[PDB]
């Protein structure tokens, strides 16, 4: 009776440990593949900064693109992005999250603002095409806007997953800020940047906008993937210690 059931309870936790250890070890392999990046990174988006880096801070549709995880057990990461959406939430708002948890969580919490969400099965690496698919869906059914904000998870350290963001103003608003920067002592950081860009033809300036927008998203998703595997490593190794204590 009691001798058999307490053994079968213990046999339950033994299978629990073995299956959770499979996730641990598989995510190490992904983390080793993912860390092949930290040595590189950052220098790819040097001139992306001069285009889109806002100093700080609702009239015509504010798009938000939060980058969430597929399956759970990552921990304080999907919850962190939900706090950013709940903190901002203006009247003019529309959501297009990225990940299965984002699709499930934002659909119930915000049925009015949520349009649809993008899913990646994580079979191949985070590439430009995926980032263009995000940018092009960010204005398709959602159409034009004032800006496209991209909430994501920065990876500075294995323990510390920082919560960060990229602001992409719309081309009409962006060209006006660019024209100010080109012909004024204001801005300063992008005086000759705006002059050199505006000297080129109109398609080139529009393709420069599209390119660096997709490049800004490409960093965000790739940085989130690196944060995803790191945070899950801490949560799963936390789960194992919980299973072992039981």
């Amino acid at each position: 009776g009691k001798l058999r059931l307490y053994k079968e309870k213990l046999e339950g936790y033994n299978r629990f440990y073995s299956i959770v250890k499979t996730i641990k070890m598989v995510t190490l392999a992904k983390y080793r593949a993912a860390q092949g990046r930290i040595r590189t990174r950052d220098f790819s988006l040097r001139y992306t900064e001069l285009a889109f880096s806002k100093p700080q801070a609702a009239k015509n549709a504010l798009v938000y693109i939060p980058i969430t995880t597929n399956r759970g057990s990552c921990g304080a990461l999907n919850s962190n992005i939900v706090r950013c959406i709940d903190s901002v939430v203006s009247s003019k708002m529309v959501l297009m999250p990225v990940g299965k948890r984002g699709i499930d969580s934002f659909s119930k919490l915000y049925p009015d603002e949520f349009r649809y969400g993008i899913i990646n099965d994580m079979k191949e690496s985070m590439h430009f095409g995926y980032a263009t698919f995000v940018i092009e869906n960010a204005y398709e059914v959602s159409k034009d806007a004032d800006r496209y904000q991209v909430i994501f998870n920065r990876f500075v350290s294995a323990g510390v997953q920082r919560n960060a963001v990229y602001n992409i103003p719309s081309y009409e608003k962006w060209k006006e800020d660019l024209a100010d920067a080109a012909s004024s002592d204001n801005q300063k950081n992008r005086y000759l940047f705006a002059n050199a860009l505006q000297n080129e033809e109109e398609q080139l300036i529009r393709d420069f906008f599209d390119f660096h927008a997709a490049l800004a998203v490409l960093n965000a998703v790739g940085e989130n993937e690196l944060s995803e595997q790191a945070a899950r490593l801490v949560a799963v190794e936390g789960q194992l210690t919980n299973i072992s204590s039981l």
């Binding site: 949520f114 969400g117 899913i119 099965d121 191949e124 095409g129 995926y130 698919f133 092009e136 599209d210």
Partner: protein, 66 residues
Amino acid sequence: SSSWRDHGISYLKYLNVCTETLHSTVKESRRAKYERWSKPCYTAQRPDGAGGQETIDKVPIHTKDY
């Protein structure tokens, strides 16, 4: 026939066609490494009814549907 710009198709879709072509010209010995930075593997969808996702179908995803 000629102009990719005049039949819709934004600059970003052209780049994806350009990269995917450049990946298809890679040597046999080391093509696996390059194909994973291009090969489409994502969709857009929302849950409707009860556990039955729609799939939107607006942004082409694949190269030949551009």
